[PDB]
Design a protein around this nucleic acid. Sequence first.
RNA 1: CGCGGGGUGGAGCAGCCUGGUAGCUCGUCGGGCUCAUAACCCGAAGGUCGUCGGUUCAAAUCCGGCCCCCGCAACCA
RNA 2: CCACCAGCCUACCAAACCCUGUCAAACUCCGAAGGGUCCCAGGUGGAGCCUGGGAGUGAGGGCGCGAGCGAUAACGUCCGCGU
RNA 3: AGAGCGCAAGGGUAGAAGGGGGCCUGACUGCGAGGCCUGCAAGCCGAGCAGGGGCGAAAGCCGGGCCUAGUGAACCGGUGGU
RNA 4: UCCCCCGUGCCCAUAGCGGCGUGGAACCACCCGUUCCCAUUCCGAACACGGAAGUGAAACGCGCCAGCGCCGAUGGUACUGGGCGGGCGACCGCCUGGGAGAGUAGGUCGGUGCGGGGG
Lengths: 134, 181, 30, 98, 76, 44
Amino acid sequence: RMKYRKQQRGRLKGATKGGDYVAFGDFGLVALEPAWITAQQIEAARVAMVRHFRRGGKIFIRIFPDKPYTKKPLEVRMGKGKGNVEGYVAVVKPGRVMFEVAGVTEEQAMEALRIAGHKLPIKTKIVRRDAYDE
Amino acid sequence: PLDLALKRKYYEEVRPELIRRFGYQNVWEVPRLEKVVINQGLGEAKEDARILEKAAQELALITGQKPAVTRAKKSISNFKLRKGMPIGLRVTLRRDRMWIFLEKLLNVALPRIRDFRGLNPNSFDGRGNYNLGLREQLIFPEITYDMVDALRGMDIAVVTTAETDEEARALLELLGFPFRK
Amino acid sequence: VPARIICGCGNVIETYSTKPEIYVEVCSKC
Amino acid sequence: KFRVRNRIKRTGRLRLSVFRSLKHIYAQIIDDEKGVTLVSASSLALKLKGNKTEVARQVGRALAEKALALGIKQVAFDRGPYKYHGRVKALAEGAREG
Amino acid sequence: TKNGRDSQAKRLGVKRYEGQVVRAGNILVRQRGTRFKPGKNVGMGRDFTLFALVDGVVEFQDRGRLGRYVHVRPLA
Amino acid sequence: LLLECTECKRRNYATEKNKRNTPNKLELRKYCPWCRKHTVHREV
RNA sequence: CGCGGGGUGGAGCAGCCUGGUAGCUCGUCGGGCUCAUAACCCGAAGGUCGUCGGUUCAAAUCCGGCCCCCGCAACCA
RNA sequence: CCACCAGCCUACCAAACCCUGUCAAACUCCGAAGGGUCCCAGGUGGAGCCUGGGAGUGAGGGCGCGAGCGAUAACGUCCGCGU
RNA sequence: AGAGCGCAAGGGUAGAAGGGGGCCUGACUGCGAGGCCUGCAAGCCGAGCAGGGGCGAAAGCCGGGCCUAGUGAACCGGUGGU
RNA sequence: UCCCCCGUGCCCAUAGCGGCGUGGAACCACCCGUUCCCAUUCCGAACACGGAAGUGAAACGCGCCAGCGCCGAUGGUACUGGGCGGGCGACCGCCUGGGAGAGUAGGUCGGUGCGGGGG
Ligand SMILES: [Mg+2]
Ligand SMILES: [Mg+2]
Ligand SMILES: [Mg+2]
Ligand SMILES: [Mg+2]
Ligand SMILES: [Mg+2]
Ligand SMILES: [Mg+2]
Ligand SMILES: [Mg+2]
Ligand SMILES: [Mg+2]
Ligand SMILES: [Mg+2]
Ligand SMILES: [Mg+2]
Ligand SMILES: [Mg+2]
Ligand SMILES: [Mg+2]
Ligand SMILES: [Mg+2]
Ligand SMILES: [Mg+2]
Ligand SMILES: [Mg+2]
Ligand SMILES: [Mg+2]
Ligand SMILES: [Mg+2]
Ligand SMILES: [Mg+2]
Ligand SMILES: [Mg+2]
Ligand SMILES: [Mg+2]
Ligand SMILES: [Mg+2]
Ligand SMILES: [Mg+2]
Ligand SMILES: [Mg+2]
Ligand SMILES: [Mg+2]
Ligand SMILES: [Mg+2]
Ligand SMILES: [Mg+2]
Ligand SMILES: [Mg+2]
Ligand SMILES: [Mg+2]
Ligand SMILES: [Mg+2]
Ligand SMILES: [Mg+2]
Ligand SMILES: [Mg+2]
Ligand SMILES: [Mg+2]
Ligand SMILES: [Mg+2]
Ligand SMILES: [Mg+2]
Ligand SMILES: [Mg+2]
Ligand SMILES: [Mg+2]
Ligand SMILES: [Mg+2]
Ligand SMILES: [Mg+2]
Ligand SMILES: [Mg+2]
Ligand SMILES: [Mg+2]
Ligand SMILES: [Mg+2]
Ligand SMILES: [Mg+2]
Ligand SMILES: [Mg+2]
Ligand SMILES: [Mg+2]
Ligand SMILES: [Mg+2]
Ligand SMILES: [Mg+2]
Ligand SMILES: [Mg+2]
Ligand SMILES: [Mg+2]
Ligand SMILES: [Mg+2]
Ligand SMILES: [Mg+2]
Ligand SMILES: [Mg+2]
Ligand SMILES: [Mg+2]
Ligand SMILES: [Mg+2]
Ligand SMILES: [Mg+2]
Ligand SMILES: [Mg+2]
Ligand SMILES: [Mg+2]
Ligand SMILES: [Mg+2]
Ligand SMILES: [Mg+2]
Ligand SMILES: [Mg+2]
Ligand SMILES: [Mg+2]
Ligand SMILES: [Mg+2]
Ligand SMILES: [Mg+2]
Ligand SMILES: [Mg+2]
Ligand SMILES: [Mg+2]
Ligand SMILES: [Mg+2]
Ligand SMILES: [Mg+2]
Ligand SMILES: [Mg+2]
Ligand SMILES: [Mg+2]
Ligand SMILES: [Mg+2]
Ligand SMILES: [Mg+2]
Ligand SMILES: [Mg+2]
Ligand SMILES: [Mg+2]
Ligand SMILES: [Mg+2]
Ligand SMILES: [Mg+2]
Ligand SMILES: [Mg+2]
Ligand SMILES: [Mg+2]
Ligand SMILES: [Mg+2]
Ligand SMILES: [Mg+2]
Ligand SMILES: [Mg+2]
Ligand SMILES: [Mg+2]
Ligand SMILES: [Mg+2]
Ligand SMILES: [Mg+2]
Ligand SMILES: [Mg+2]
Ligand SMILES: [Mg+2]
Ligand SMILES: [Mg+2]
Ligand SMILES: [Mg+2]
Ligand SMILES: [Mg+2]
Ligand SMILES: [Mg+2]
């Protein structure tokens, strides 16, 4: 990675761009609540996914932690947080697609995604590739 | 002195010859020389201009023109380079001087070249132009043996009006370019 | 000024360049 | 390379544009801010002879005649792409004869 | 914590908008570079400051690839 | 190095700034005095 | 965590402040004297300059983050 | 597979480039709402402007909104527009 | 135009502010309409007038440097001059 | 009033890149030459002078083509002066006025002003 240093928190306003459509794979898991998703979260979901269907199809991850999450170490009030204790998170507004699966039965992807949901703080939804394209 | 052997070769033989293989609708479409350039990469002597006044007057003899130094643009300590203190020689001969020069090179220089075998044909850079190097410089006429204090070769560029080099390939042979083929 | 190039095999060339004297050994005619 | 024109336009007014060809030489008195020509002593459009440097000095006065007859004096000389020296300097030197 | 720093605010930008009457010599625009080019009846100083050259009215002209300009249309 | 010019055949002065070691041993640029008009001015 | 110092051939230290070429002692290796070893004599080899970035024509050298070692400090109720 | 250096394979990592899909206070091809100002007009109001006499205040607090800090903690803290 | 513009960053910029050359010293004196900014004091921009000048054929340009940092009231004392 | 060309402006890519074609009477360019004015950190490449011959190849001029570039609606949406309403909040919903960017349909290889030469 690269960027530079640590970064302001901002605010998770309306899910304006906080929405999307599937663009890879047949099934997807979309967010319903705004949240900072941690790397430890994304990963734990992704692994628990393959872990479920061993040697299975292929999973896509469309959200990516670039925001440095800071944290002062049990003290008072000087300077900006050394931070990064939770390290990095990804901004997720309600409606954005996060995880794609592909090359597995519906009941095989209705579980994989069902699980990845649990490893996440927010409430989420599963989706077929409807028919809406560009 | 607007006259010489090769200067004619191009007109009363080589000019119509070109029209034979390509048949140009217009008198100017037929390719011509118009620029001979010479350059010596003496980054070797970039130290003192001491060993430089010589290669200059040496170059002047073989070309007739008074050469012009070329300074360094960048700076590279990786081999002693900075600002413009370095050096290189460049001389752009055209007109008659170009012909009186090409006559020597094609009819005297090349043949007396140590174990010559023919000019490399691949040296045509897409558009109609040719380039080639010479390790020595004594392979020129008015250069005596006791005169050279150090063998410093160089390379010459020649520019035609040829668009494609396919045509250019021909124009050179017709003038007297002994291609290795 | 004009000059004569005495090739190492006949063909005494003649063109223009300083020093008319020219002991050229061998040339394009060989 | 028309930096010369930009520099002149900033000044007063009355730009004496001096286009010149291989066998020609023209000159206009253009009051910009409206883009209009007031005088135009052409050469290969007048009739003049053939000597160029001698010809230009003539066409110069051809403006002077038509210039004062209207009321003009700002010698703002638009020495175009051409360096002030040859038939331009003469065209000028001549224009300045009045 | 090495960071608690900054420099004075320079209060630049357009100092006289279009239509505003102006006295000769008074300032029209202070700027970082030439975010505005001078033009008719408007001079420019060492810092790129644009100042009216005669009593009149300010008006702005955009000329695309050639940039924006500030003019003083005189009257008296 | 800080400096001030002196007028010839006189003793006028003016604001200045030499540079010592760098290529600048001598210095005598022009400058208009109040008395008289235009003359050379030594370093000093 | 705070302030200060340090990390360079196998060991222990120079070099840095003031950028251009890495030096000292020991050990190692080859060859000598000895019956032989050591001592001693003659040669030779060996260094990513902790690490990741930045400045510069150029970084052991200057700037910044990180890991490691050293010392100091961690007080008032 | 080999050495003279050459050739092919490469469900390894990967510069440039392209397609699909995205992130950015210190990125912007774009770009609102609004705000600022000048001109003209409505506006006679415990409006406004000029010169003077007298002051107090210079610890604010909560709430809404917009950001930083903090932990998208605090009857927390620091600014901005309101109240 | 992603380069360069001495040096941090930004704005600006080849229709030059960038690279090269000739002559050159306006890194002038005496002023200064009108402004920017501003509690004070400071800081900033500046057309033009006079003197005597530099480059240009001229229109003109020059009161240092592409610009924004490179700095210090008053007191006390030093040197030069009227 | 009409047509071609030369010079010079105005807006500032719908004016551009590129591919095909056409123009030398006129104008323009290349073009012949380097004695003179002038010029090259070398060279008549450039700048310059004196100019016939040849040419429209180059450059430019005009005209076609939509591959690149550029322009680009309508419709809806995000956002949002102002006014409200629901929940612990990270938030969300309505009324009123304003209203993007992206994208879709499409558009473009220009429009014009003054002087001059020429049918
Ligand atoms: Mg993956
Ligand atoms: Mg405390
Ligand atoms: Mg620290
Ligand atoms: Mg601050
Ligand atoms: Mg502050
Ligand atoms: Mg701009
Ligand atoms: Mg000024
Ligand atoms: Mg100093
Ligand atoms: Mg000093
Ligand atoms: Mg060690
Ligand atoms: Mg040293
Ligand atoms: Mg020393
Ligand atoms: Mg030893
Ligand atoms: Mg031994
Ligand atoms: Mg030995
Ligand atoms: Mg030895
Ligand atoms: Mg050895
Ligand atoms: Mg180091
Ligand atoms: Mg250790
Ligand atoms: Mg230890
Ligand atoms: Mg202790
Ligand atoms: Mg203590
Ligand atoms: Mg204690
Ligand atoms: Mg105590
Ligand atoms: Mg005590
Ligand atoms: Mg006490
Ligand atoms: Mg190989
Ligand atoms: Mg190889
Ligand atoms: Mg292969
Ligand atoms: Mg932004
Ligand atoms: Mg910015
Ligand atoms: Mg909007
Ligand atoms: Mg308003
Ligand atoms: Mg308004
Ligand atoms: Mg009343
Ligand atoms: Mg009241
Ligand atoms: Mg009141
Ligand atoms: Mg009033
Ligand atoms: Mg009062
Ligand atoms: Mg008080
Ligand atoms: Mg106080
Ligand atoms: Mg308080
Ligand atoms: Mg309040
Ligand atoms: Mg609230
Ligand atoms: Mg509310
Ligand atoms: Mg705080
Ligand atoms: Mg938040
Ligand atoms: Mg609170
Ligand atoms: Mg760029
Ligand atoms: Mg730049
Ligand atoms: Mg630069
Ligand atoms: Mg600079
Ligand atoms: Mg910049
Ligand atoms: Mg421009
Ligand atoms: Mg310069
Ligand atoms: Mg310059
Ligand atoms: Mg110079
Ligand atoms: Mg005044
Ligand atoms: Mg004032
Ligand atoms: Mg004040
Ligand atoms: Mg006060
Ligand atoms: Mg002035
Ligand atoms: Mg005067
Ligand atoms: Mg001035
Ligand atoms: Mg400078
Ligand atoms: Mg300047
Ligand atoms: Mg300069
Ligand atoms: Mg500024
Ligand atoms: Mg005192
Ligand atoms: Mg008619
Ligand atoms: Mg083709
Ligand atoms: Mg010709
Ligand atoms: Mg001569
Ligand atoms: Mg003459
Ligand atoms: Mg002369
Ligand atoms: Mg001529
Ligand atoms: Mg043709
Ligand atoms: Mg073309
Ligand atoms: Mg057609
Ligand atoms: Mg199109
Ligand atoms: Mg298309
Ligand atoms: Mg719309
Ligand atoms: Mg709630
Ligand atoms: Mg909420
Ligand atoms: Mg609307
Ligand atoms: Mg749109
Ligand atoms: Mg087009
Ligand atoms: Mg038009």
